[PDB]
């Protein structure tokens, strides 16, 4: 039972490298709570296109933070093997507890 | 409906300068750039020249003036 949370800006750099920390746990541990979605935290920036006046133009910019869960029931010491240090995501950050 | 709180403010440039003029007399004239300082008892009688952003105005101080800020007697804008 290890709480897992995967955050990122890319919906593939997570959704994908979130199965590596599941398959590499399907055969070395429990069944895992699979990969759990979780709502996104979209931060918007609305700015004026032109550098001077013309305040009715704007153009929008969002920076959405996607989230993932997982959760490996049964703190399998045999799963900690495949995992530990074997992945490929560069634009990701992990937060995990027991 | 004015306010300040529980710790009335006054700039110490004169807070003590003024009280010192009491330690040995009263003196004549004063020059401040703190129109933001409240007026307190020990100032009455004195004559302070507050700056109106351009000059130092001779502001005589009376009992019925305590509590007010000095700026309130040194008008900044010149009109008609």
């Amino acid at each position: 039972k290890i709480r897992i949370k995967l955050r990122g800006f890319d919906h593939k750099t997570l959704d994908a490298s979130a199965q590596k920390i599941v398959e590499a746990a399907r055969r070395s541990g429990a069944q895992v709570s699979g990969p759990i979605p979780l709502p996104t935290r979209v931060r918007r920036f609305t700015v004026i296109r032109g550098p001077f006046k013309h305040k009715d133009s704007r153009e929008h910019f969002e920076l959405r933070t996607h989230n993932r869960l997982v959760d490996i029931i049964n703190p399998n010491r045999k799963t900690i093997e495949q995992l530990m240090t074997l992945d490929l995501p560069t634009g990701v950050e992990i937060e995990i507890k027991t | 409906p004015r306010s300040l709180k529980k710790g009335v403010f006054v700039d110490d440039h004169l807070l003590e300068k003024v009280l010192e003029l009491n330690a040995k007399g009263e003196k004549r004239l004063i020059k401040t750039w703190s129109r933001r300082s409240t007026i307190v008892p020990e100032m009455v009688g004195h004559t302070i020249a507050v700056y109106n952003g351009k000059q130092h105005v001779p502001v005589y101080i009376t009992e019925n003036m305590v509590g007010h800020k000095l700026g309130e007697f040194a008008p900044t804008r010149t009109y008609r």
Binding site: V42, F45, V47, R49, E59, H60, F61, E62, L63, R64 | -
Partner: protein, 60 residues
């Protein structure tokens, strides 16, 4: 952004209040977003260049 004014960077402003933000890239005072340190203009330019990670053109 006059130079003698980019003096802002002063951990010693004398009074936390006088501590105003400026554009990290241009010195622009107004419209300086906090999540980027950039101003409203720079933010759009760079986002266009792709240098602002995650930052994308939002439409809905």
């Amino acid at each position: 952004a006059r130079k003698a004014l980019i003096e802002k960077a002063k951990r010693t402003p004398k009074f936390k209040v006088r501590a105003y933000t400026r554009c990290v890239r241009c010195g622009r005072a107004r419209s300086v977003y906090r999540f980027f340190g950039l101003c409203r203009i720079c933010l759009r330019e760079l986002a266009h260049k792709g240098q602002l990670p995650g930052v994308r053109k939002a439409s809905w």
